[PDB]
Amino acid sequence: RFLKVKNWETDVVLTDTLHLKSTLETGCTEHICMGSIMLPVRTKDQLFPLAKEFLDQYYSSIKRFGSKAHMDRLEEVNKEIESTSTYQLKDTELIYGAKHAWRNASRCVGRIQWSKLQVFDARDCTTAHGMFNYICNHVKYATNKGNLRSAITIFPQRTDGKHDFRVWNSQLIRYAGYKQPDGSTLGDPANVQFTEICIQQGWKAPRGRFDVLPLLLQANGNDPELFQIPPELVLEVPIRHPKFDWFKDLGLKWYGLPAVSNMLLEIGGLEFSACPFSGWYMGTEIGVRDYCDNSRYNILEEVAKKMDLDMRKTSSLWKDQALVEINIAVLYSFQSDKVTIVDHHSATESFIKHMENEYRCRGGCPADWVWIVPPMSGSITPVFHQEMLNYRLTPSFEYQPDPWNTHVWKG
Amino acid sequence: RFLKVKNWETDVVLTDTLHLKSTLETGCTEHICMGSIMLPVRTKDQLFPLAKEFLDQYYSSIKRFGSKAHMDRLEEVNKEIESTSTYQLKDTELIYGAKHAWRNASRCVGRIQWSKLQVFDARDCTTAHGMFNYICNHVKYATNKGNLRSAITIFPQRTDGKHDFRVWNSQLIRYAGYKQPDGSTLGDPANVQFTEICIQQGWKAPRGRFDVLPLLLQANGNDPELFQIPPELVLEVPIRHPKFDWFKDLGLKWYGLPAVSNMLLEIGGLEFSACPFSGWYMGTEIGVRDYCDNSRYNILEEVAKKMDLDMRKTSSLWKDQALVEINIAVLYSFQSDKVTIVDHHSATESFIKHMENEYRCRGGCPADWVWIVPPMSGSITPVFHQEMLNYRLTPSFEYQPDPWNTHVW
Ligand code: HEM
Ligand code: HEM
Ligand SMILES: Cc1cc(N)nc2cc(-c3ccc(CN)cc3)ccc12
Ligand SMILES: Cc1cc(N)nc2cc(-c3ccc(CN)cc3)ccc12
Ligand SMILES: C[C@H](O)[C@H](O)[C@H]1CNc2nc(N)[nH]c(=O)c2N1
Ligand SMILES: C[C@H](O)[C@H](O)[C@H]1CNc2nc(N)[nH]c(=O)c2N1
Ligand SMILES: [Zn+2]
Numbered sequence: 158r159f160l161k162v163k164n165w166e167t168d169v170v171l172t173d174t175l176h177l178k179s180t181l182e183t184g185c186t187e188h189i190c191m192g193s194i195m196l197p198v199r200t201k202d203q204l205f206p207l208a209k210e211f212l213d214q215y216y217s218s219i220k221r222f223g224s225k226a227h228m229d230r231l232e233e234v235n236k237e238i239e240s241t242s243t244y245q246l247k248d249t250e251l252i253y254g255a256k257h258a259w260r261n262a263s264r265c266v267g268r269i270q271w272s273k274l275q276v277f278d279a280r281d282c283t284t285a286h287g288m289f290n291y292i293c294n295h296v297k298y299a300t301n302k303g304n305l306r307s308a309i310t311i312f313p314q315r316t317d318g319k320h321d322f323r324v325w326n327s328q329l330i331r332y333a334g335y336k337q338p339d340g341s342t343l344g345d346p347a348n349v350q351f352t353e354i355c356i357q358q359g360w361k362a363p364r365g366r367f368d369v370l371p372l373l374l375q376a377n378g379n380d381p382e383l384f385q386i387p388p389e390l391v392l393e394v395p396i397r398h399p400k401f402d403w404f405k406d407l408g409l410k411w412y413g414l415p416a417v418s419n420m421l422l423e424i425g426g427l428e429f430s431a432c433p434f435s436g437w438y439m440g441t442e443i444g445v446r447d448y449c450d451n452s453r454y455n456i457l458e459e460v461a462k463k464m465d466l467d468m469r470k471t472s473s474l475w476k477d478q479a480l481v482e483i484n485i486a487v488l489y490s491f492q493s494d495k496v497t498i499v500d501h502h503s504a505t506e507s508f509i510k511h512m513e514n515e516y517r518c519r520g521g522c523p524a525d526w527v528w529i530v531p532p533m534s535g536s537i538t539p540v541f542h543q544e545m546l547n548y549r550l551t552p553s554f555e556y557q558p559d560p561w562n563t564h565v566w567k568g
Numbered sequence: 569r570f571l572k573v574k575n576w577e578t579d580v581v582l583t584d585t586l587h588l589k590s591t592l593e594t595g596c597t598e599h600i601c602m603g604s605i606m607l608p609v610r611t612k613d614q615l616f617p618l619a620k621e622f623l624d625q626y627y628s629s630i631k632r633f634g635s636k637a638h639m640d641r642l643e644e645v646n647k648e649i650e651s652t653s654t655y656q657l658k659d660t661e662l663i664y665g666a667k668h669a670w671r672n673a674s675r676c677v678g679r680i681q682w683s684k685l686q687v688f689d690a691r692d693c694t695t696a697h698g699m700f701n702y703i704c705n706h707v708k709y710a711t712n713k714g715n716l717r718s719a720i721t722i723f724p725q726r727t728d729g730k731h732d733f734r735v736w737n738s739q740l741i742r743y744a745g746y747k748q749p750d751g752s753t754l755g756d757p758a759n760v761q762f763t764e765i766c767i768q769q770g771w772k773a774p775r776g777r778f779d780v781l782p783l784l785l786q787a788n789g790n791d792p793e794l795f796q797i798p799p800e801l802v803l804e805v806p807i808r809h810p811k812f813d814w815f816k817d818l819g820l821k822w823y824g825l826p827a828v829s830n831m832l833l834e835i836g837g838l839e840f841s842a843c844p845f846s847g848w849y850m851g852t853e854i855g856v857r858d859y860c861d862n863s864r865y866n867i868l869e870e871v872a873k874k875m876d877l878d879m880r881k882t883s884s885l886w887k888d889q890a891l892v893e894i895n896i897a898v899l900y901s902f903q904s905d906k907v908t909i910v911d912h913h914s915a916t917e918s919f920i921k922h923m924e925n926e927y928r929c930r931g932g933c934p935a936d937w938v939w940i941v942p943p944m945s946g947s948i949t950p951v952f953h954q955e956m957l958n959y960r961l962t963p964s965f966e967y968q969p970d971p972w973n974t975h976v977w
Contacts, residue, residue, distance in 0.1 A: 165606065166863055176600050185596035185603075189587055190958040192596075192603030193937035195576065440883075445947055452577050457948070471913040472851075472899045477892045477945045481885055488883045502882035526604035526938055532947035534888045536856055537868070541943065547601040 164509075166542035171513065173546050175521030180210075181549035192547070193527050196556055198318040201242045204426045208234050208244060211425030211552070215253055243316060245280075246424060252276045254424035255309050258552040259434070264528035266504055266540070267436055269511035274434075275299075275308040282312055285374040285382040288322070288431070292329060292372060295433060296390050300414050303392060305437040305497035311422065312431035313377075322431035323560045325373035325381050327351065329416035329433055330391055333368040344368065347453055354561055358383055367410055375431075375560060380567050394494050398486040403463050407456065411443050411487070413496045421557045430557060437497040439504045444484035445532045456483065480533055501531035505538040512543070523548045575920075577953035582923070584957050586932030591621070592960035603958065604938050607967055609729050610837060612653055618837030619645050619655060622963070626664055654727065657835065663687045665835035665963045666720050670845075672961040675939035677915050677951070678847055680922035686710075686719040693723050696785035696793040699733070703783060703844060707740060707801045711825050714803060716848035716908035722833065723842035724788075733842035734971045736784035736792050737762065740827035740844055741802055744779035755779065757863055765972060770794055778804075778821055786842075786971060805905050809897040814874050818867070822854045822898070824907045830970070835963040845965075848908040850915050855895035856943045867894075891944060912942035916949040923954070934959045 160173040184197030191197045209231060216227040237244040246254065260271040275298065279291040291310050299308045312322040327348075334349035336342055342349060344366050352370065356362050360371050360383055369391055375381040392413040398404035416435035421428055448454050457479050461468050464482065466475035491498035499507075508529065515522035524545035535541045571584045595608030602608050610618075623645065627638040641658075648655040657665065671682040686709065690702040706721045723733040738759075744766075745759040753760060755777050763781065767773055771782050771794055780802055786792040803824040809815035827846035832839060859865045868890050872879050875893070877886035902909035910918075919940065926933035935956035946952045 160600075163606070166861070179599050182598040183596070183601045184598075185594065185601045186598060187593045187596065188590050188959060189571075190594045190596045190601060190603045190936075192601050192958065193954075193956045195574070195955060449948055450577070450953075452953075472903065472911040474892055474896045474899070474911065474913075476913065476948050477895070480945060480948055481888045481892055484888070485885050488885070492883065500883040500885065502887065530946070532952065534891060534944055535941070535946050536943035537860055537887050537891060542861075543604075544606060545604045547603070548599060 160546060162544035162546060164539075164543050166539060169513070171516040171521075173516065173521035175519055175550075176523070176546055176548045179523075179548040179550055181551065181553075183548060192525075199315075199426065199428065201238050204243070205235055205238050207426030207551075208238065211250075211254070214257075215250055218253065243314070243427070246427065248278060251278060251280075251311065251424070254552045255311065255422065255432075255434075257550075258422055258424065258554050261523065261550040261553055263523040263525040263547050263549070266439065266508045266529050266531075267499075268522075269507045270307055270436070273307060275306060277308060277310040279310050279312045280314070282322070283376060285376045285379070285384070288312065288324070288374040288376055289372060289384040292324075292374075292433060293386065293390060295435070296329060296386065296414065296416070299416065299435045300390070300392050303413065303494065303496040305414065305435075307434075307436045309422075309432060309434035311429050313429075315428040315430050319565075320378035321375065321560075322377065323375040323381070324418040324431050324433055325351070325354070325375060325560055326370060327417070327419045329372070329418050329435070330386070330412045330414055331370050332366075332412075333362060333364075333370050335362070335364055345447075345454065355383065366408070369412070375564070378565075380564075381560075392496065394490050394496055396486050396490045397493075398482065399489045401463075401482070401486075404460075404482075404486055407459065407463075409448070409454075409456070411447065413438075413491070415442065419557070419559070421555045422552070423555055424552045434554075437499065438491070439499050439501055439531070440484055440488045440491075441501045441531050441533055444487035445480060448483055448487075449480055484533065501534065501538060505529075505531060505540045509539050509543060512545075521546065523550060571957060573955040573957055575950075575954045577950060580924075582927040582932075584927070584932040586926075586930055586961075587934070587957055587959045589961060590934075590959040591962055592964075594959060603936075610839070612649060615654065615837045616646060616649050618962075619649065622665070622836030623661075625668075626661055629664065654725075654838070655836075657838065659689060662689060662722065662835070666722065666833065666843075668961075669833055669835065669963040669965050670720075672934060672964050674934035674936040674958050674960070677850065677919045677940050677942075678910075679933075680918045680925075681718060681847070684718060686717060688719060688721040690721050690723050691725070693733070694787065696787045696790070696795070699723065699735075699785040699787055699842070700783060700793075700795040703735075703740060703785070704798065704801060706844060706846070707797065707825065707827070710827065710846045711801065711803050714824065714905065714907040716824065716846075718845075718847045720833075720843055720845035722840050724840075726839040726841050730976075731789040732786070732971075733788065734786040734792070734975075735829035735842050735844055736765070736786060736971050737781060738828065738830045740783070740829050740846070741797065741823045741825055742781050743777070743823075744773060744775075744781050746773065746775055756858075756865065766794065777819070780823070786975070789975075791977065792971070792975075803907065805901045805907055807897055807901045808904075809893065810900045812874075812893070812897075815897055818870070818874075820859070820867070822858065824849070824902070826853065830968070832966045832968040833963070834966055841968060843965075848910065849902075850910050850912055850942070851895055851899045851902075852912050852942050852944055855898040856891060859894055859898075860891055895944065912945065912949060916940075916942065916951040920950050920954060923956075932957070934961055 163170050184191040216222045234244045295310045332345040333352045334345040372384040373381045396409040418433035422432040460479040461475045467473040468475045512522045525547045526545045595602040627633050645655050666687045667685050710719045743756040744763040745756040746754045783795040784792045804821050807820040829844035833843040860868045871890045872886045878884040923933045936958045937956045
């Protein structure tokens, strides 16, 4: 079976055959679409078919399918599974797996860059202190004095689910959030629950609006431990506006390195529960969502006030006007400080080129429209008019439950 | 299988049971989601269960499920179908069916108004001249001197596919589009082929930027006919900006009445191929899409120029800045001229409330996130953070082929 997608701005029609290689499920059925739903101990029984499928893909990509090297590897992995109940990936396989997990990430608009991923092998790690060291080196490498470089650090795979490696932070660098007695929130409302866990684990909180959170790191199923990232490793950018001199007086800043640390990397049935990865920001992530979401810093009001906008009726679009200015400031600040950032126009344009390239050389590109279209100015970016097919390929990044909900405490 | 939807800005959770009523299909499977795809002659057999399903929901809605009246009507339609190979809706059923087709339109953000629909029964129409008359009356009623009122006009149902009633226009009111020898396009580019069909069918084009297109009306399957809508029925709004005086110099205006005329209304298995319906605009439909789409009026660059913005790099967000000002102007203009319009903030907020209402009194609300979220400022509107379930309920509005691709001329 063949499937078609149309760009309605350009009438370009592309043909998807890659969706045939899809195994996992979407959540949708013939009678319902769950396209906008945010989120819709493995045995040797089901593991070798997963391993075989991966190795078949791996050896196809290196043009050695059916070779002796391929057949021996399959033999080797098989024996290791019946004997040890799991198996170990070779370095080459790990690197391939991590890159393709990104390549397959249907919600990621930045995938033109997928083949340029620095992979750090941390599978020899054994303790939280070792985790801290590996993560510090990731941050230094990735940050590169403002010239950001994509990277991922991969900690040991799950075994019996009782000895998981986890990074308890949702991102390596994030600001604290504090609920005040009067109901107000200081800092980042998104991080209030995590901030509280940290504080309980012994963190002494500065209680400011932009405090970098400590790392809470769990090795081999043990209780997590607290570590402070050296401040010299945490690159930050003061937010100012190119025409509005009062904007700096809002006292806003943000960190340069987006590094998500709570997802799970699946490769050939193996599960890597600690695998922090990082790239660079698209401006709207900070300027639209981080700053202007009602449930975050929510600075629309103060910015609209200082612009002296008609905030009485919404049909004055004061909200819309402030939003643009805030996003102008974020991009201006990052560029002025020579910290890698990309605007949503550039990024979406790149994605369309990526996607077309992928349809031609790969037979498709799974893509989640709901997530790919930017949170402002949707239809003046070229992905808005682009039809997309969403399906799940492996290797993949998956969601996993927050560890504090599942962890068995040692004491 | 009793599904939940969460709002991530408020933690409000709603439970959907209405989806289990759904009949038709979405285009998705467990292995693929087609949620962003734009577009994914009935026998005696298929007709009677369809009629039964409809009459069942109708008599439940008036709390007379399992009544003599119910069973009698059921038997009456049953006999008429066996006999005539089709059937006719009672007036009350027709009004119910039309209101619920709107109610079920998962892509429509304006559905909080769904039960205040004025239904004009035009099933006695026989000619294009008659169609023109019914359509002029619709337009005048809907427009109401700027105080817009929702309305639908329903022409005779399909019979054998050879006697279809069709409005060939996509909307009752739309501006012409002409391609220049120079290369570009004057007027509305989306309407370039239709503007040509009209001329190709006999229209005399003034070749302006805002020429109201003629109606092309097809009755009983005959060749369609051109009719000019009386200009005093076409309410238009001159577009000016509340702070930029040079804005008027652009020479922009739009029409007040959005009236879509190329869809198909399905009730109880019956197919109404001509059923123009109208409401009032959400501001972004004109200012974001109509004015700023690249394959439309595409005036973004011209506007930014006049604002002296830095158009050298995309990261100046000059497009975004212009986009907002244009949309401020559209709203300002309509509001100034007392022509009904709604901004995307109030409309999306209205929709969340409608959702709340539907989950409470009905058990759910089919909704297509990809279309409900406005084309600008998405995440600062409350629908962005609202999970939605999309499924197809009947009665419904459906797409149908363009007539010129079908009509045996
Ligand atoms: C290099 C520049 C990159 C840019 C500009 C970028 C941009 C984005 C954006 C804007 C999102 C939506 C997230 C949100 O709105 O909160 C996203 C999602 C995502 N990104 Fe990328 N990204 C980049 C690199 C990477 C890398 C290096 C990886 C992994 C190695 C990655 C993996 C993902 C995944 C898995 C998602 C989906 C998250 C989910 O399913 O919820 N990205 N990206
Ligand atoms: C009264 C004010 C109304 C408002 C503000 C409104 C708003 C909207 C908007 C913004 C769209 C998206 C269309 C686009 O982006 O091109 C839409 C779609 C739609 N509207 Fe409404 N609408 C209104 C009334 C109505 C009425 C009266 C009907 C029918 C009786 C209707 C039926 C539909 C349908 C069927 C679609 C989508 C068709 C599809 O592709 O499935 N609307 N509406
Ligand atoms: C590597 C990378 C770069 C970037 N600019 N944004 C990301 C954003 C995410 C991301 C962030 C948040 C969420 C859920 N709110 C889902 C995915 C993950 C990775 C990213
Ligand atoms: C009645 C009404 C009012 C309004 N403001 N917009 C509409 C927009 C539509 C519409 C327009 C186009 C399409 C297909 N692109 C689907 C639906 C239909 C009816 C509308
Ligand atoms: C390809 C994509 O589905 C297409 O551009 C859709 C997306 N969302 C939309 N949403 C609305 N409201 N109206 C539209 O015309 C579209 N177009
Ligand atoms: C409910 C809805 O799916 C949710 O708000 C999504 C919508 N699209 C998104 N798109 C991106 N890029 N990031 C997000 O966090 C979200 N949130
Ligand atoms: Zn779907």
